[PDB]
């Protein structure tokens, strides 16, 4: 699996979101169903939607 890294901090506004900090790494679980991607944080192990433009491949 290819890892993704947060380019900015993000604070959840919906309970289906993940919050995260710049530098945090993710595995992408669903990046194929819209511009928000279901992600699992390697820091926290939590899963949720993140805005795709906030991350880049590691």
């Amino acid at each position: 699996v290819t890892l993704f890294v947060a380019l900015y901090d993000y604070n959840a506004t919906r309970w289906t979101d993940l919050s995260f900090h710049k530098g945090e790494k993710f595995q992408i679980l669903d990046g194929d169903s819209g511009d928000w991607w279901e992600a699992r944080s390697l820091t926290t192990g939590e899963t949720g939607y993140i805005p795709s433009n906030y991350v880049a491949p590691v």
Binding site: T16, D30, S33
Partner: protein, 223 residues
Amino acid sequence: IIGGTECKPHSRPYMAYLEIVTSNGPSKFCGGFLIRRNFVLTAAHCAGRSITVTLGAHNITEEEDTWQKLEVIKQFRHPKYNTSTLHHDIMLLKLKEKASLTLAVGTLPFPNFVPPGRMCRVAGWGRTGVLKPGSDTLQEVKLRLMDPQACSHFRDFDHNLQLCVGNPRKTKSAFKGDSGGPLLCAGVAQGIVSYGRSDAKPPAVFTRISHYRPWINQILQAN
């Protein structure tokens, strides 16, 4: 479920607890409801690589004889489901075989556009507060269907597609872990828990089942 009460055990025998797996990392959890002996309805955002459905549960942390655990063989996520807005947050799950009908396990098969103003009920095993764990026991709460204007702050909210649920003046609401669960109004499933504010302040947003009835009917007839 925030501000609710523990359900009488097995009083909502259609309720499904879903455990959704993805390789390596920890699984995720949602609610659902049995609408046919081998179909569960739930939210599209609950999808994943494989799903196990637990029926007949009250305290989900303690196995008992009422439990029926079934593997999902096919996920039918709504084809227009969009992750940015969560529009069309609805999915049918085909089970590997039929559930047995018992006092604790039963279907809620479908029998109109539901207007604002009525009182409805939602149940689930989700968090009982922003920072609370998921509930051991099935909880339920009575919530008001609001005017769609009560959900204005979710800019993409669409009254044709979604219900606006929970008087903002109260703390009562569905929350994390309740996704996929049914909103029943006068005993009929009318909504599916979809999403709400990170701070749990109601109203929350539910999929309006009436809009998807033809699609549901289509999947059922062919499967």
